[PDB]
Design an enzyme around this catalytic site. Sequence first.
Site, PDB file in Angstrom:
ATOM      1  N   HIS A  10       0.834  -1.232   0.000  1.00  0.00           N
ATOM      2  CA  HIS A  10       0.000   0.000   0.000  1.00  0.00           C
ATOM      3  C   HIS A  10       0.861   1.272   0.000  1.00  0.00           C
ATOM      4  CE1 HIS A  10      -0.004  -0.094   4.612  1.00  0.00           C
ATOM      5  NE2 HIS A  10       0.108   1.242   4.387  1.00  0.00           N
ATOM      6  N   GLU A  27      -0.212  -7.745   1.019  1.00  0.00           N
ATOM      7  CA  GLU A  27       0.522  -6.558   1.507  1.00  0.00           C
ATOM      8  C   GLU A  27       2.044  -6.747   1.373  1.00  0.00           C
ATOM      9  OE1 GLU A  27      -1.181  -3.002   3.606  1.00  0.00           O
ATOM     10  OE2 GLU A  27      -0.420  -3.530   1.631  1.00  0.00           O
ATOM     11  N   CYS A  87       5.117   2.105   7.805  1.00  0.00           N
ATOM     12  CA  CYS A  87       4.816   0.888   7.014  1.00  0.00           C
ATOM     13  C   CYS A  87       5.968   0.643   6.013  1.00  0.00           C
ATOM     14  CB  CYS A  87       3.429   0.884   6.379  1.00  0.00           C
ATOM     15  SG  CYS A  87       2.046   0.752   7.562  1.00  0.00           S
TER      16      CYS A  87
END
EC number: 3.6.1.15
Lengths: 172, 171
Positions: B28, B52, B137
């Site tokens: 993402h 992911e 992230c």
Amino acid sequence: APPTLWSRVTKFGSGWGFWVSPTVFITTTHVIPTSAKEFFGEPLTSIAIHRAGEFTLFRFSKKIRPDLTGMILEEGCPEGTVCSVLIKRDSGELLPLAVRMGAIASMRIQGRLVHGQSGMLLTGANAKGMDLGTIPGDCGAPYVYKRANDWVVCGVHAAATKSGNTVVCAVQ
Amino acid sequence: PTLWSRVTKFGSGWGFWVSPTVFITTTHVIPTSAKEFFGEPLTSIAIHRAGEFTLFRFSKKIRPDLTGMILEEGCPEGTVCSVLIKRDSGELLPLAVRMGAIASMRIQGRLVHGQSGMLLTGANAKGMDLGTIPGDCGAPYVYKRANDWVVCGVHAAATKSGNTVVCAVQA
Ligand SMILES: O=C(COc1ccccc1)Nc1ccccc1O
């Protein structure tokens, strides 16, 4: 950790020390150059030096760091407190290593006898080496934690075991 | 020679150089408008996406200064990993994480598939050098096994309390 705590960490001797106020600097006794007769342009005669084992406090007659506010220094912290050790590494990298603090301890670390507040790093399984643990050049780095609305300093880095898991903070 | 040099700012988060030609990140955070990454035309980059987890394989050496590291599909339950977080402040935050099972987890209202973990800091924020934030992230999960460092995935999600994290894994 806030920028104003990083600004207080000064390269000193074979490690580091920390400005508690404009007139008070703390460090680990063994990083102090043994021949040194002048600190920050001031002669010994104009400095009050208070040494308890591996903890040393310098009080200056003049404001060396007037950009700073005085903050709280305590004699260690409650068992169970999580602290950050404010370690500077090569090229403006800042490593605030997380440590869960334990009891006042006496240990033998690499033949040397060390006394202070013990702690366990919360960085990895085993913190052997520079990526997840401490190195000898980190001696004098401060142990800090946040209370409600402010930050406290409660000691300076004195030693680490060969596994790297256990650290000792020298205390006032 | 440091693990930290392998952690690189990328998109809306970070990624990690496994070798001179292999770069992993969280799906993402990847830009959705691009003609090149790290100066190489997308023409010449192999992209392997699984949920992911994303792996890029370049046709030339982007990081020739690096040796190749072991990449595995998660780790055993009970392994204490380190998540290697870089902050835009210049801070490096290695945080211990005790790893659990692979699962589909509801994290702040969305489903995320990967390896669950809990931070050994446990308590709270109060000086966010003890937990993760959304901008973290793509940060890698690593651990030491005998003489060898192992990378076993990338940071994908965390709960509001910050106790629970999700490591996205290969395959
Ligand atoms: O005075 C100093 C630096 O050393 C000097 C420089 C000029 C004349 C006398 C002494 N302050 C200072 C700044 C940053 C960190 C710690 C410091 O003591």
